[PDB]
Scaffold this motif. Structure first.
Motif, PDB file in Angstrom:
ATOM      1  N   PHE A 211      33.620  35.189  22.502  1.00 28.36           N
ATOM      2  CA  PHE A 211      34.737  36.197  22.724  1.00 28.36           C
ATOM      3  C   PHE A 211      35.123  36.533  24.143  1.00 28.36           C
ATOM      4  CE2 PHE A 211      37.553  38.801  21.019  1.00 28.36           C
ATOM      5  CZ  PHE A 211      37.288  40.344  21.505  1.00 28.36           C
ATOM      6  N   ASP A 212      34.498  36.449  24.847  1.00 25.74           N
ATOM      7  CA  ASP A 212      34.794  36.934  26.433  1.00 25.74           C
ATOM      8  C   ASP A 212      35.796  35.667  26.820  1.00 25.74           C
ATOM      9  OD1 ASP A 212      33.320  39.227  26.320  1.00 25.74           O
ATOM     10  OD2 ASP A 212      31.384  37.812  27.116  1.00 25.74           O
TER      11      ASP A 212
ATOM     12  N   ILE B 170      37.424  38.048  15.276  1.00 20.82           N
ATOM     13  CA  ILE B 170      39.125  38.171  15.825  1.00 20.82           C
ATOM     14  C   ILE B 170      39.906  36.814  15.744  1.00 20.82           C
ATOM     15  CG2 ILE B 170      40.430  39.085  17.462  1.00 20.82           C
ATOM     16  CD1 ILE B 170      37.041  40.370  17.550  1.00 20.82           C
ATOM     17  N   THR B 171      41.038  36.483  15.132  1.00 26.78           N
ATOM     18  CA  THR B 171      41.704  35.399  15.275  1.00 26.78           C
ATOM     19  C   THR B 171      42.823  35.604  16.126  1.00 26.78           C
ATOM     20  OG1 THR B 171      41.334  35.160  12.777  1.00 26.78           O
ATOM     21  CG2 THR B 171      43.419  34.035  13.528  1.00 26.78           C
ATOM     22  N   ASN B 172      43.424  36.495  16.475  1.00 25.44           N
ATOM     23  CA  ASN B 172      44.597  36.616  17.283  1.00 25.44           C
ATOM     24  C   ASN B 172      44.521  38.071  18.047  1.00 25.44           C
ATOM     25  OD1 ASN B 172      46.317  35.449  14.562  1.00 25.44           O
ATOM     26  ND2 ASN B 172      46.348  34.212  16.550  1.00 25.44           N
ATOM     27  N   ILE B 173      45.065  37.866  19.357  1.00 23.88           N
ATOM     28  CA  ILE B 173      45.178  39.023  20.314  1.00 23.88           C
ATOM     29  C   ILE B 173      46.759  38.994  20.597  1.00 23.88           C
ATOM     30  CG2 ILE B 173      44.215  40.545  22.000  1.00 23.88           C
ATOM     31  CD1 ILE B 173      41.831  38.857  21.990  1.00 23.88           C
ATOM     32  N   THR B 174      47.478  40.298  20.666  1.00 25.64           N
ATOM     33  CA  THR B 174      48.686  40.244  21.100  1.00 25.64           C
ATOM     34  C   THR B 174      49.000  41.532  21.681  1.00 25.64           C
ATOM     35  OG1 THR B 174      49.408  38.844  19.087  1.00 25.64           O
ATOM     36  CG2 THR B 174      51.021  39.714  20.050  1.00 25.64           C
ATOM     37  N   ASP B 175      49.997  41.654  22.811  1.00 29.89           N
ATOM     38  CA  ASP B 175      50.610  42.487  23.345  1.00 29.89           C
ATOM     39  C   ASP B 175      51.926  42.673  22.695  1.00 29.89           C
ATOM     40  OD1 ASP B 175      51.409  44.828  25.015  1.00 29.89           O
ATOM     41  OD2 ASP B 175      49.663  44.005  26.470  1.00 29.89           O
TER      42      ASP B 175
ATOM     43  N   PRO C 208      52.573  37.264  25.357  1.00 29.88           N
ATOM     44  CA  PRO C 208      50.927  37.353  25.169  1.00 29.88           C
ATOM     45  C   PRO C 208      50.408  37.076  23.982  1.00 29.88           C
ATOM     46  CG  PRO C 208      52.450  39.007  26.717  1.00 29.88           C
ATOM     47  CD  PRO C 208      53.183  38.187  26.150  1.00 29.88           C
ATOM     48  N   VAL C 209      50.672  36.038  23.373  1.00 27.56           N
ATOM     49  CA  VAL C 209      49.989  35.635  22.149  1.00 27.56           C
ATOM     50  C   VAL C 209      48.976  34.852  22.237  1.00 27.56           C
ATOM     51  CG1 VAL C 209      50.769  34.560  19.844  1.00 27.56           C
ATOM     52  CG2 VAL C 209      52.345  35.908  21.014  1.00 27.56           C
ATOM     53  N   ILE C 210      47.777  35.126  22.000  1.00 28.01           N
ATOM     54  CA  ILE C 210      46.556  34.399  22.185  1.00 28.01           C
ATOM     55  C   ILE C 210      46.022  34.187  20.901  1.00 28.01           C
ATOM     56  CG2 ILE C 210      44.476  34.504  23.071  1.00 28.01           C
ATOM     57  CD1 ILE C 210      46.277  33.723  25.124  1.00 28.01           C
ATOM     58  N   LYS C 211      45.919  32.847  20.487  1.00 25.59           N
ATOM     59  CA  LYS C 211      45.026  32.672  19.247  1.00 25.59           C
ATOM     60  C   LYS C 211      43.812  32.062  19.542  1.00 25.59           C
ATOM     61  CE  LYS C 211      47.497  30.656  15.959  1.00 25.59           C
ATOM     62  NZ  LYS C 211      47.276  31.743  14.693  1.00 25.59           N
ATOM     63  N   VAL C 212      42.563  32.382  18.895  1.00 29.34           N
ATOM     64  CA  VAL C 212      41.335  31.985  19.410  1.00 29.34           C
ATOM     65  C   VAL C 212      41.295  30.444  18.886  1.00 29.34           C
ATOM     66  CG1 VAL C 212      40.293  34.115  19.545  1.00 29.34           C
ATOM     67  CG2 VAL C 212      40.314  32.809  17.467  1.00 29.34           C
TER      68      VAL C 212
ATOM     69  N   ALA D 109      38.075  34.229  25.199  1.00 27.81           N
ATOM     70  CA  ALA D 109      39.332  34.621  24.633  1.00 27.81           C
ATOM     71  C   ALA D 109      39.975  35.912  25.222  1.00 27.81           C
ATOM     72  CB  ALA D 109      39.372  34.873  23.008  1.00 27.81           C
ATOM     73  N   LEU D 110      39.108  36.849  25.522  1.00 23.80           N
ATOM     74  CA  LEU D 110      39.478  38.298  25.950  1.00 23.80           C
ATOM     75  C   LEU D 110      40.027  37.897  27.483  1.00 23.80           C
ATOM     76  CD1 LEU D 110      39.393  41.120  25.383  1.00 23.80           C
ATOM     77  CD2 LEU D 110      37.411  41.300  26.569  1.00 23.80           C
TER      78      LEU D 110
ATOM     79  N   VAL E  11      53.278  42.893  32.270  1.00 25.15           N
ATOM     80  CA  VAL E  11      53.650  43.748  31.206  1.00 25.15           C
ATOM     81  C   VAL E  11      53.545  45.328  31.852  1.00 25.15           C
ATOM     82  CG1 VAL E  11      52.694  45.054  29.116  1.00 25.15           C
ATOM     83  CG2 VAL E  11      53.125  42.307  29.304  1.00 25.15           C
ATOM     84  N   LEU E  12      52.304  45.634  32.432  1.00 30.29           N
ATOM     85  CA  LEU E  12      52.088  46.973  32.939  1.00 30.29           C
ATOM     86  C   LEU E  12      53.114  47.421  33.937  1.00 30.29           C
ATOM     87  CD1 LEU E  12      48.113  47.614  32.712  1.00 30.29           C
ATOM     88  CD2 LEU E  12      49.850  47.429  30.987  1.00 30.29           C
TER      89      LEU E  12
ATOM     90  N   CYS F 296      48.441  38.755  30.092  1.00 32.24           N
ATOM     91  CA  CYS F 296      48.931  39.829  30.181  1.00 32.24           C
ATOM     92  C   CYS F 296      49.416  39.925  31.479  1.00 32.24           C
ATOM     93  CB  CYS F 296      48.027  41.055  29.666  1.00 32.24           C
ATOM     94  SG  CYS F 296      48.111  41.359  28.017  1.00 32.24           S
TER      95      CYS F 296
ATOM     96  N   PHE G 232      43.354  36.237  27.513  1.00 29.82           N
ATOM     97  CA  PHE G 232      44.471  37.381  26.981  1.00 29.82           C
ATOM     98  C   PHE G 232      44.781  38.186  28.127  1.00 29.82           C
ATOM     99  CE2 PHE G 232      45.361  41.819  25.222  1.00 29.82           C
ATOM    100  CZ  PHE G 232      46.312  41.566  24.718  1.00 29.82           C
ATOM    101  N   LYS G 233      43.631  38.623  28.904  1.00 30.18           N
ATOM    102  CA  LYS G 233      44.006  39.467  30.123  1.00 30.18           C
ATOM    103  C   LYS G 233      44.854  38.768  31.140  1.00 30.18           C
ATOM    104  CE  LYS G 233      39.792  40.935  31.247  1.00 30.18           C
ATOM    105  NZ  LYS G 233      38.856  41.701  32.012  1.00 30.18           N
TER     106      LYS G 233
ATOM    107  N   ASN H 152      34.926  43.934  18.126  1.00 28.59           N
ATOM    108  CA  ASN H 152      33.777  42.581  17.859  1.00 28.59           C
ATOM    109  C   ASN H 152      32.514  43.244  17.656  1.00 28.59           C
ATOM    110  OD1 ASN H 152      32.962  40.038  17.496  1.00 28.59           O
ATOM    111  ND2 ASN H 152      33.230  39.436  19.684  1.00 28.59           N
TER     112      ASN H 152
END
Ligand SMILES: [Mg+2]
Ligand SMILES: [Mg+2]
Ligand SMILES: [Mg+2]
Ligand SMILES: [Mg+2]
Ligand SMILES: [Mg+2]
Ligand SMILES: [Mg+2]
Ligand SMILES: [Mg+2]
Ligand SMILES: [Mg+2]
Ligand SMILES: [Mg+2]
Ligand SMILES: [Mg+2]
Ligand SMILES: [Mg+2]
Ligand SMILES: [Mg+2]
Ligand SMILES: [Mg+2]
Ligand SMILES: [Mg+2]
Ligand SMILES: [Mg+2]
Ligand SMILES: [Mg+2]
Ligand SMILES: [Mg+2]
Ligand SMILES: [Mg+2]
Ligand SMILES: [Mg+2]
Ligand SMILES: [Mg+2]
Ligand SMILES: [Mg+2]
Ligand SMILES: [Mg+2]
Ligand SMILES: [Mg+2]
Ligand SMILES: [Mg+2]
Ligand SMILES: [Mg+2]
Ligand SMILES: [Mg+2]
Ligand SMILES: [Mg+2]
Ligand SMILES: [Mg+2]
Ligand SMILES: [Mg+2]
Ligand SMILES: [Mg+2]
Ligand SMILES: [Mg+2]
Ligand SMILES: [Mg+2]
Ligand SMILES: [Mg+2]
Ligand SMILES: [Mg+2]
Ligand SMILES: [Mg+2]
Lengths: 152, 70, 117
Positions: free
Chosen positions: B11-12, C95-100, B1-5, B14-15, B27-28, B22, B18-19, C89
């Motif tokens: 933003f949405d 934001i550059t990265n997001i990680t679990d 779960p590595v997300i680089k913009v 990228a979010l 994961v959950l 995941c 990421f969702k 935000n």
RNA sequence: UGAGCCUUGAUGUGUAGGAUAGGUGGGAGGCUUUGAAGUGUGGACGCCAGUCUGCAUGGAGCCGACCUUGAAAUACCACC
RNA sequence: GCCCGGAUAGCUCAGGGUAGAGCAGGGGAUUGAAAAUCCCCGUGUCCUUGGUUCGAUUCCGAGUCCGGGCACCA
RNA sequence: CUUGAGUCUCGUAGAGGGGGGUAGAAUUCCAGGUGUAGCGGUGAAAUGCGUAGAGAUCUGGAGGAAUACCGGUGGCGAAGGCGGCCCCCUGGACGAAGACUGACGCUCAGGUGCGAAAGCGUGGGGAGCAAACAGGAUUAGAUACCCUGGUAGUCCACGCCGUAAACGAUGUCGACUUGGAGGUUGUGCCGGCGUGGCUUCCGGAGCUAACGCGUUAAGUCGACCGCCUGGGGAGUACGGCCGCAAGGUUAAAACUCAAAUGAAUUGACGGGGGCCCGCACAAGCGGUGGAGCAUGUGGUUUAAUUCGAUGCAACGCGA
């Protein structure tokens, strides 16, 4: 109910202003089916308020009204035995109805000589944010504000 | 779960990426399975129950077309 | 007291509470805020709104260092995961990265017993 | 790294009020081209109201009692 | 006896042009309960007295009580 | 004699077994840097941890137990059971063609061996979990469910124990009797066509009290073994054998009842699931429960206080 069949009931205007809002105000204030007494009281109080305010009968009443309208309320909802207090938006017709109900209720609990004078004083106070109706409006708003975390 | 913009997206987006990552990583589910101890008997019983229900539903839907309702 | 201009946001979300910290790239903390220390206690402490408020307070408590570039690491299954990042935000960082980074045993130890509620 | 002894810089905006003025003053003339009113500029504090600032363009003005304060204005000027 | 510190809301107590935070108690929101959350309500020479100051709880002096270290203890 | 049984040659799959080594994730503990007022937990709380610096985040170190994804009504084993990767020792199964021995077979009372978990003995180990135990709650009480801690034990070597809903509630071996859809593992011929081993679901005749079983039979047969004879008492007492103990195995009687039981059918009920309705809730308006009086009832009193209705559906009721 379980069916939702009803439509809507037509409200007749007041005699000497032609506004259904004031007719509903008279209806709220009326007791025991004695409508003439309610109209006399409402007209006298409006006259006194307009004289001490100077604008008119109508828009002074509307201005005093818009300082009591709420925009959010709380309803109880039980899930696991306990009750959350979910805040919910208030539709405009309910807003006006609650505003009139609170104004009349506030004017009822006062220590003046005549009901017309009581209503005039309470309504003038409402027009400038001092009546107990404004206090009730603010209390409802802040109680809804506290339970913002439950607004789904 | 590595997300680089990447360059120049809202933003949405990228979010949501990421969702989706995941959700597809499971994961959950893994963190909720591993919260309490499950006896081996319970694991085998639930696996067999899931298989039986899946097969029964498959047969029911397979035979569902031929019968007509009205 | 110092300028860093970039840092890592660590979000620790659980079923009971959520904690947000900001650190530099080397792990040293700069400030933190929590959902239990934002006026919410009991059933109100484990809601996404509390996580959002905690993120806002953490962002406000770290204005001094002048961070503009931010990275996010999220661990845990709690409700407050998306709300915290959205509020972060909205605070104005990029934001550059997001990680679990939630832990996973590859077997591990033996979990507690099931609750007979 | 803690404390002392020094020396300097500022800092200290009840209420009136041009005035981020503490009691106390030799005393209303110094400063200014031993580059000045005010500009661009960079910096520290700041209850952020108001100081201060490295340099320059710029060019040479501010300026002291004077009336609201109990007080007078780093106008040259001592002590804390 | 000498010295070192303190006395303020019903309780705990923070703080020269000032009295403050929470909890105790009253009611309404509120429901079958305490939560929960709302709102308001006072709770004042800041021990007393005198002395400086354009006024002192924020300064000094003394007397009431309390704690600590010491003295006297023949 | 070769057709049952067995041997030999080539290969295939597999968490079958015993012994040693090793990898990565995570939890706990120790040390240190940043940093500051809460953390943890619940239906809500509290016990508990924290300004003596916790929780959060970063780096280094120690130790123990178990192997995410693959993973599958998939595989192996007589059953119990078996799951990271590598090496050493080792058992069984299946397949394709061929040569060999020549009934060498099936079943098995006594007997011998293996046998989950808990438990016992001696010696090590101890991260996580967690009987007993202590505290906090909930409650009418709560020797519980829930929370915070926590010792035996769970792990290793050797030795006992010998029991489980040890279940397919279905002993082992052989033969015969219509079909369909899959999974897994070999082999032959030209993706198609065959042919073996194991395996899951549905179903025909037949069987069965029914439910269901149905070529992996609970159908039609043969060989050998184990066991049953109404419900309690009782798998208990006494005796024998076994065990360090806990206890295991064998196994009655008096007395008592007229039944105990299995499968299916119609209802009713559920703090089981769906879909609807009603001033049933919700939104409102006005009342009753407080006061004085009218009226009916209970109780008490009296010579009598006539009789009847007395949850909703009796009590301004017969009247
Ligand atoms: Mg209706
Ligand atoms: Mg737990
Ligand atoms: Mg193998
Ligand atoms: Mg093996
Ligand atoms: Mg530490
Ligand atoms: Mg097998
Ligand atoms: Mg082998
Ligand atoms: Mg021969
Ligand atoms: Mg035998
Ligand atoms: Mg064992
Ligand atoms: Mg044991
Ligand atoms: Mg032992
Ligand atoms: Mg031991
Ligand atoms: Mg207890
Ligand atoms: Mg524990
Ligand atoms: Mg034990
Ligand atoms: Mg047995
Ligand atoms: Mg049996
Ligand atoms: Mg058997
Ligand atoms: Mg057979
Ligand atoms: Mg069948
Ligand atoms: Mg039979
Ligand atoms: Mg019998
Ligand atoms: Mg026995
Ligand atoms: Mg015996
Ligand atoms: Mg023993
Ligand atoms: Mg029966
Ligand atoms: Mg029955
Ligand atoms: Mg039913
Ligand atoms: Mg029902
Ligand atoms: Mg209602
Ligand atoms: Mg009454
Ligand atoms: Mg009677
Ligand atoms: Mg009768
Ligand atoms: Mg009636």
């Amino acid at each position: 109910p379980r069916r939702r069949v009803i439509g809507q009931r037509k409200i007749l205007p007041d005699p000497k202003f032609g506004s259904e809002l004031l007719a509903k105000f008279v209806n709220i204030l009326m007791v025991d089916g004695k409508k003439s007494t309610a109209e006399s009281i409402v007209y006298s109080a409006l006259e006194t308020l307009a004289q001490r305010s100077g604008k008119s009968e109508l828009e002074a009443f509307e201005v005093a009204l818009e300082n009591v309208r709420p925009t959010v309320e709380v309803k109880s909802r039980r899930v696991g035995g306990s009750t959350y207090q979910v805040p919910v938006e208030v539709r405009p017709v309910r807003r006006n109805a609650l505003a009139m109900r609170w104004i009349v209720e506030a004017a009822r609990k006062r220590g003046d000589k005549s009901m017309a004078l009581r209503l005039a004083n309470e309504l003038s106070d409402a027009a400038e944010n001092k009546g107990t109706a404004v206090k009730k409006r603010e209390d409802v708003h802040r109680m809804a504000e506290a339970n913002k975390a439950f607004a789904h | 779960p590595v997300i680089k913009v990447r360059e120049n997206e809202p933003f949405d987006v990228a979010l949501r990426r990421f969702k989706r990552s995941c959700e597809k990583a499971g994961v959950l589910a893994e963190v909720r399975r591993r919260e309490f101890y499950e006896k081996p008997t319970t694991e085998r019983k639930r696996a067999k129950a899931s298989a039986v229900k899946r097969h029964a539903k498959k047969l029911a839907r397979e035979n569902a077309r031929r019968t007509r309702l009205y | 007291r110092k300028q860093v201009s970039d840092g890592v946001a660590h979000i620790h979300a659980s079923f009971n509470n959520t904690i947000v910290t900001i650190t530099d790239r080397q792990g040293n903390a700069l400030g933190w805020a929590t959902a239990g220390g934002s006026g919410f206690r009991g059933s109100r402490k484990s809601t996404p709104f509390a996580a959002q408020v905690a993120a806002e307070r953490c962002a406000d408590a770290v204005k001094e260092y002048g961070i503009k570039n931010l990275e996010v690491m999220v661990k845990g299954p709690g409700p407050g995961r998306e709300s915290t990042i959205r509020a972060l935000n909205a605070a104005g960082f990029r934001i550059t990265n997001i990680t679990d980074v939630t832990p996973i045993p590859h077997x591990g130890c033996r979990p507690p017993k099931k609750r007979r509620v």
